[PDB]
Paper text:
D183N is a pathogenic variant of AGT that causes Primary Hyperoxaluria Type I (PH1), a severe disorder of glyoxylate metabolism. Although the mutation is conservative, the variant shows a 2.3 × 104 fold reduction of the catalytic efficiency, whereas the affinity for PLP is almost unchanged. Following our novel hypothesis, and to understand if the low catalytic efficiency may be due to a non-native geometrical strain, we have solved the structure of the D183N mutant at 1.8 Å resolution and at a similar pH value (pH 5.5 vs 5.0) of the wild type. The structure of D183N shows that the interaction of the asparagine side chain with N1 is loosen, going from a 2.6 Å distance in the wild type to 3.0 Å. As a consequence of the strain relaxation, the torsion angle between the imine and pyridine planes is reduced by 10° (from 36.2° to 26.3°) and the cofactor tilts in the direction of the Lys (si face), assuming a conformation that superposes very well with the geometrically optimized reduced internal aldimine. Clearly, the H-bond between the mutated Asn amino group and the deprotonated pyridine N1 is not as strong as the salt bridge present in the wild type enzyme. Therefore, in the mutant the opposite torsion effect is uncoupled and the spring mechanism, responsible for the tilt of the PLP pyridine plane during the transaldimination step, is lost. In the D183N variant the H-bond replacing the salt bridge isn’t strong enough to keep the internal aldimine under strain and the pyridine plane is tilted towards the si side, whereas in the S187F variant the salt bridge is conserved but the counter pulling force of the Schiff base linkage is lost, due to the rearrangement of the Lys-209 loop, and the pyridine plane of the internal aldimine is tilted towards the re side.
Residue numbers in the entry:
A (entry chain A): 4 to 390
B (entry chain B): 5 to 390
């Protein structure tokens, strides 16, 4: 009868984790209140008290997105899981789908779109670029899409995509606007209803400083109508918006068991939303803008070059630096964690090998942290081998 | 000029009630798991995170009793693991046989339909289980590529026998997928020895970790089918080729796919360390004994167990026939209102027919049996009887 697999020796040792100052494109470090919420005991996942916390979270999401949309809720997964929830519900097989492919995030949207049978049309742009109204209109006119995807904060390239006017333009072409604000939310201006966005989503782990694992999403009535009139069922059950809507209190029926929400992660997310509700959006935008401007000045004084030349196009939360000539970017990243216990990153997708990425996210977006990463980079530039 | 003002409810502190959770799960968290949930973040692609991931993988191989290389965590709840299994294993048009003896088989049918399989339910009333002979007829008639069976049917209180089923499926060139969300750690289960090709469970049952992560492992036969199919799975998030790579299961450097739930992995790591320290067979013994003690106390109250055959009772989730004359909703409310204990009614086909009492992991104790027994005694004495 004897078990062949034995208790793993490594698990018989205590868990211990290193102390790391996370100054990459995210996830970010957690403030005390969010760590404390993470250590709390479970409550019933369909209890009145749980529903009250969920309702508070929904109010918080409506605040940070600046929307009145009733159909606003949490997706029980990471930012990719929220994008897939948007696409698997809004798009039916054969639907035309226009995508701003200007970095890895647009590429990921193309991949998901293809998999669920859309007719996908990328607008491809080198890393560093953004879309104009004219570029979008040309795509809308040519491809007659039911949905456009735009990345607001392109954290792979350091770009801040302008959003004014795009929603109205899409709507003239009978197109819904979907916007990724995972890296932008809380760090730079964003107004869902004022900007005519139809589907907006973000993640817990960037400027909100919650642990990775949950994501935030909201749907206009136009998007709501399309999702509820579909004649095909979405390919996913877990992400079916009719079930999720009901369980999050968004429709007129009693909440029915769908899947078990991540109770403890929702405590933490609730607290992250309370913190930014206390600080205020505009104050948070100012904090990130100023920290970013300070970082840009210090990096240039090190002799590094910002990847995005035009300051109005720079994403405050994630700054791209050209890799300095003669260095191997891997040495610089390794040097910084090895000798300073600071995380930064290289590039990602099309910016792989071209940039270093430095994040300033929420409570970590400070002049004091700018000074730490500046000194770490200075030392890497002094000691890493140069060709 | 901002449209939306800060919500006043969020300007108050978070406060949660104390609840003793003795339903079908999620279960309460032991102090070590709560402490891990309170730790600081590390880098989601850091060397230290990969080591923790590797320790988790060894833990899963331990609790499943497998050596499969393709073993990993799904970043979502038990439904998400089931969808990962089916969306990668099944291509559109594949024949899919399902043991629909409660809500969990019904859910498998729904997902299977959505992803274009040709679904064949074997439908049984709540309380039933499948024999080898009934599965063999389904295999012969429908020539499925995959069979789904629920091991611990937490909606009906049933313990499904597993010996023999994998071997049967393989004679018919069918893969065996088993849901062990409710049974893992609380009753015997051997992935390799029972010939199971896909096995999954959840964090929040007997493991006593918070909900939100799930455990999955694939045999070489399942691995071969997933890596052979000519169509891409409908999901990117759940694509096994990307996930296998990031979890260190394949021959290539780990590439970014999606950000794993760092803090939840700390907690799941500790949940696996705890049962590694206890030892699997000791855990099985604890659940078996706690459930037998529960069964006698409940019968001594005049209650009737829903599953008549003791060998068919799932130790982790016990169903009780709702007693004649009472409104089950009054009984459930009485227990939370006056004793701060959570129990449940039924689910899916058992709705209105049962109360469900869970004994899960560190909560599967004689002490907790005494607590819920006293609460039900009081409920029977004070709830209205028709
Ligand atoms: C608890 C349970 C599930 C739960 O899945 P979630 O998606 O995490 O809610 C699924 N199947 C069984 C048998 C369970 O007991
Ligand atoms: C961090 C980020 C994501 C990542 O999502 P995960 O699935 O949580 O890893 C997606 N898009 C953008 C713009 C991001 O900054």
């Amino acid at each position: 009868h004897k078990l062949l697999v034995t208790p793993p020796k490594a698990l018989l040792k205590p868990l211990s984790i290193p102390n790391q100052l996370l100054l990459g494109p995210g996830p970010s470090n957690l403030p005390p209140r969010i760590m404390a919420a993470g250590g709390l005991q479970m409550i019933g996942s369909m209890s009145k008290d749980m529903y009250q916390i969920m309702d508070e979270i929904k109010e918080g999401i409506q605040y940070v997105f600046q929307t009145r949309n009733p159909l606003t809720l949490v997706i029980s997964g990471s930012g990719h899981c929220a994008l897939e929830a948007a696409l698997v519900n809004v798009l039916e097989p054969g639907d035309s789908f226009l995508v701003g492919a200007n970095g890895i995030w647009g590429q990921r949207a193309v991949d998901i779109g293809e998999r669920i049978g859309a007719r996908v049309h990328p607008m491809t742009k080198d890393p560093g670029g953004h879309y104009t109204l004219q570029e979008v209109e040309e795509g809308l006119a040519q491809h007659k899409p039911v949905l456009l995807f735009l990345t607001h904060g392109e954290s792979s390239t350091g770009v801040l995509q302008p959003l004014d006017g795009f929603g109205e333009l899409c709507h003239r072409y009978k197109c819904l606007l979907l916007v990724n604000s995972v890296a932008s939310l809380g760090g730079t201006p964003l107004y869902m209803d004022r900007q005519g966005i139809d589907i907006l989503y973000s993640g817990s782990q960037k400027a909100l400083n919650a642990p990775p694992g949950t994501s935030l999403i909201s749907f206009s009535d136009k998007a709501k109508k399309k999702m509820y009139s579909r004649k095909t069922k979405p390919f996913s059950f877990y992400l079916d918006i009719k079930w999720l809507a009901n369980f999050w209190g968004c429709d007129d029926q009693p909440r029915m068991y769908h899947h078990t929400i991540p109770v403890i992660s929702l405590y933490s997310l609730r607290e992250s939303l309370a913190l930014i509700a206390e600080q205020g959006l505009e104050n948070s935008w100012r904090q990130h803008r100023e920290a970013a401007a300070y970082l840009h000045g210090r990096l240039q004084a090190l002799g590094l070059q910002l990847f995005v030349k035009d300051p109005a196009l720079r994403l405050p939360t994630v700054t791209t630096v050209a890799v300095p000539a003669g260095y191997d970017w891997r040495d610089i990243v390794s040097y910084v964690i090895d000798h300073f216990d600071i995380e930064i990153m290289g590039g990602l997708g099309p910016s792989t090998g071209k940039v270093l990425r430095i994040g300033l996210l929420g409570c970590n977006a400070t002049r004091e942290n700018v000074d730490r990463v500046t000194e770490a980079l200075r030392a890497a530039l002094q000691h890493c081998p140069k060709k």
